[PDB]
Amino acid sequence: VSAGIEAMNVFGGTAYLDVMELAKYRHLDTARFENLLMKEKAVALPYEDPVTFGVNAAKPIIDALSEAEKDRIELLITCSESGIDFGKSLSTYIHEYLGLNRNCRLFEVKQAAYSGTAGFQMAVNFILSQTSPGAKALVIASDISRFWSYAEPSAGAGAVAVLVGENPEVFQIDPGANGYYGYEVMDTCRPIPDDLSLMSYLDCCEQTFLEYQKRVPGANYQDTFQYLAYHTPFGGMVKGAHRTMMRKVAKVKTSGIETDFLTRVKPGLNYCQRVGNIMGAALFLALASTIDQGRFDTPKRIGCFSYGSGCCSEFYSGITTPQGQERQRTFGIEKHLDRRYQLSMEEYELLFKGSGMVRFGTRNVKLDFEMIPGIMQEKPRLFLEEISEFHRKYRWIS
Amino acid sequence: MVSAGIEAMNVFGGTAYLDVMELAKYRHLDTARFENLLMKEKAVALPYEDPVTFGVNAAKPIIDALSEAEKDRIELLITCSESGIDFGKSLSTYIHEYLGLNRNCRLFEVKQAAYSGTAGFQMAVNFILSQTSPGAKALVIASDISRFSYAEPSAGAGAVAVLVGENPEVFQIDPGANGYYGYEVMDTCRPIPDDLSLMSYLDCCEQTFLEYQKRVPGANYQDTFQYLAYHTPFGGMVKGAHRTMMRKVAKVKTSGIETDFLTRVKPGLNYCQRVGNIMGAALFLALASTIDQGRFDTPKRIGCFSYGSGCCSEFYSGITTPQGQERQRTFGIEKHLDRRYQLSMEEYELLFKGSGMVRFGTRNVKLDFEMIPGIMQSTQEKPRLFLEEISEFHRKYRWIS
Secondary structure (H helix, E strand, O other), X not given: OOOEEEEEEEEOOOEXXXXXXXXXXXXXXXXXXXXXXXXXXXXXXXXXXXXHHHHHHHHHHHHHOOHHHHOOEEEEEXXXXXXXXXXXXHHHHHHHHOOOOOOOEEEEXXXXXXXXXXXXXXXXXXXXXXXXXXXXXXXXXXXXXXXXXXXXXXXXXXXXXXXXXXXXXXEEEEEEEEXXXXXXXXXXXXXXXXXXXXXXXXXXXXXHHHHHHHHOOOOOOOOOOOEEEEOOOOHHHHHHHHHHHHHHXXXXXXXXXXXXXXXXXXHXXXXXXXXXXXXXXHHHHHHHHHHHHOOOOOOEEEEEEEEEOOOEEEEXXXXXXXXXXXXXXXXXXXXXXXXXXXXXXXXXXXXXXXXXOOOOOOOOEEOOOOOOOOOOOOOOEEEEEEEEOOXXXXXXXX | OOOOEEEEEXXXXXXXXXXXXXXXXXXXXXXXXXXXXXXOEEEEOOOOOOHHHHHHHHHHHHHXXXXXXXXXXXXXXXXXXXXXXXXXXXXXXXXXXXXOOOOOOEEEEXXXXXXXXXXXXXXXXXXXXXXXXXXXXXXXXXXXXXXXXXXXXXXXXXXXXXXEEOOOXXXXXXXXXXXXXXXXXXXOOOOOOOOHHHHHHHHHHHHHHHXXXXXXXXXXXXXXXXXXXXXXXXXXXXXXXXXXXXXXXXXXXXXXXHHHHHXXXXXXXXXXXXXXXXXXXXHHHHXXXXXXXXXXXXXXXXXXXXXXXXOEEEEEEEEEOHHHHHHHHOOOHHHXXXXXXXXXXXXXXXXXXXOOXXXXXXXXXXXOOOOOHHHOOOOOOOOEEEEEEEEOOEEEEEEEO
């Protein structure tokens, strides 16, 4: 039996800001950013959260399904490092507002940015196991940033939602072609409620691939993969990481690398420039960007490398088809990103004062939707109305 | 096709416990609303313990009995908790290090109140079933501890660790006999760092079972299952839940229920009385207690019901064998529990002041292992892991004989 992504969609915020503009406004070093390949970062409003982001990313997928297909969704995993509770998973809320069927396992995975791939891989095994024939799974990776701080202009918000099933036109995985590698490392962690990392990212990038060769004999990092998606905090480092892979692993001459980069990796970097570091969903975004931006006149193989701080990592691969690229174009992802609202610095600064309001242990709060009066002509979208004795009230808005 | 299930399983039920009765007295609470709850002892995590500690100490005796080649086939480490130490860094990183597992391994944390355990387990079973890596294994470790009115004498600490593989003598699952039901409910949640629930538990208990009939035709809640393990915060409510299942679902006369309870459910309740509500691991504990305390002269079927607040739930089943009960006896779980240190109330009260030290956002702290002087040179067991210190958010653990 086959398994993989049947559909996939991105929600890249309601609002964003120009990252360069933000660097200047921080009276900051204009030059450390110049070729980190960053343009825009999505910003979650106070009336948004990981439930919001996941729902708004998943809905367009559910909407395009029949009622019989929606009812075969029996696994909802949300993957986050932006959780709202120690025990209550984001999946509960998300399950409600998508109106999924109650005959469904639901829960939250966590392992910094590896979360997304962990969920996805669990979902693929569900399919593969055939413990419930013809079922599907919805993995939704959702993360937002709330806040030395040269990290502020990169830190984004976003979610990608991945429908996994048995007829995957958009990314059919090569079952068992996996190189997972993990070890404890004093990497960047997230312990308060709201350098080493690069070494570790690259160790993982090499070791995952070697492990994949160990299981896929004949796998070659140049010819096997027509495109390559990486966990991409920001394009700059991925460019560096690809360069370092081509020398260290593929062992090819420095003269050819930029061409290899522009043909095989640059398409996956398109949407990440628009959103920022979206953590659990960074890789999925790169994969989506890759399927939208690249050329699939015939079926092509993409290699995906996932890295999560702490750390764990994995390198897997699958085949996307022309059918699959058609499917994915119907979500009009680019068009969605274009339409977001560009914050001004004075607006961004206001958002900063009111974002304290929604904090982690937040018990009660009512949210003003016209705090930035302009923001509120598309389909309905979910927003956080209020928190009451820790419970979260969301509302649809046209 | 291929088999999947628990090859081994072990419990760590704290280093220290207290007598729950004794605790009731010391709080001036009601000898009525209590004895009725089937609680005896609750495990208490010391400040120098945590979910990493608890998981490791639970997992070690399993790893130790494995050969080096079998240990190296462990390629999935999931830890299941609602007492996570970080928003991103999973407990599995630390646990993976101190078990010295092989780096060719996926590792991460699941979360969904007390459903976490079963979630992990089910993902692990599917890993095996999928055969995406033949002959591999998985280590699911559910670990939870309680920290700070009437919920204090029930709230325990503990972990169970489950080795999942292709030769599961101790609990071989009936593939596809599940089970699962979930919906959003304003149940009890855990949102600040440190009633409806019962309704929801019982709705789930009935619905999960009905869903299992839908997929397992001929499944009958009386004759199909020789024993029954439930997510058991405390024995009392499980007794109540079993009663309510036998009337509502199996539809049998009230006169015969207590006999059914004592033969099929009571063994699984043994160890839960010694530990308390251990959340993600409550069900696994009940299953382990069941496999230790019950009779398996021939292979028997056990039905397991998992519930997590919020909520999600599942009813699955599997076959344990006599071979499997042998395996599990070699971990001497009961004996382990007997050998814990009984806190006195005055000691318990000290533990309460110093447990603030290890809060959630804790950045730096050194831990005094002789804060309750007796505890360390009390037990003279194989070595056990303890939290030495936290330094710029990173955790240093130490083995102690």
